[PDB]
Write a protein that binds this ligand. Structure first.
Ligand code: FMN
Length: 151
């Protein structure tokens, strides 16, 4: 059918997912790319401190983080690709806030993740939870399923 008008959104703590999002942007004709940020002080330069902050959000003890991103009408797109690192089998916590803000999006969603190779099944299942109510068509590592998602 008609080419899917595609938005690529990503959160990146150490820059790897940003590079992947840029690569996917280059692969998908006319795609738009937008970064999701959090304020300085939300996490930490130290990965173990960052993990512990995310965990306390996951466990319900601290609120999920507020995010900063451009104003977007999500219903301008057919497909929204959401990029994140894998954080102990979950997407990064800013993604939960993002997905909540996308509540009224009627199109297709997929997530690409970057990782060091582990806890992928958990990422998939948790992403789908966090995206409940949205039409999730797939979750995959890197750009491995970009072609599939485009059809
Ligand atoms: C808090 C934290 C938890 C992580 N947990 C996992 C994990 O469960 N499995 C894995 O393969 N990599 C894990 N990683 C590594 C990241 O998924 C990987 O470095 C990713 O490519 C980083 O993306 P980014 O640079 O966009 O933040 C973790 C990294 C951090 C900081």
């Amino acid at each position: 059918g008609m080419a899917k008008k595609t938005l690529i959104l990503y959160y990146s703590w150490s820059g790897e997912t940003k590079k992947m999002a840029e690569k996917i942007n280059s692969e998908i004709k006319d795609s738009e790319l937008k970064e999701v940020k959090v304020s300085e002080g939300t996490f930490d330069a130290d990965m173990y401190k960052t993990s512990d902050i995310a965990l306390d959000q996951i466990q319900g003890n601290k609120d999920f983080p507020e995010i900063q991103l451009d104003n977007i009408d999500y219903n301008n797109y057919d497909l929204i690709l959401i990029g994140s690192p894998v954080w102990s089998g979950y997407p990064a916590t800013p993604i939960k806030t993002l997905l909540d803000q996308m509540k009224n999006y009627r199109g297709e969603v997929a997530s690409f993740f970057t990782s060091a190779g582990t806890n992928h099944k958990a990422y998939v299942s948790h992403f789908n939870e966090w995206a409940d109510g949205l039409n999730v068509i797939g979750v995959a590592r890197d750009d491995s399923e970009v072609d599939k998602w485009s059809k």
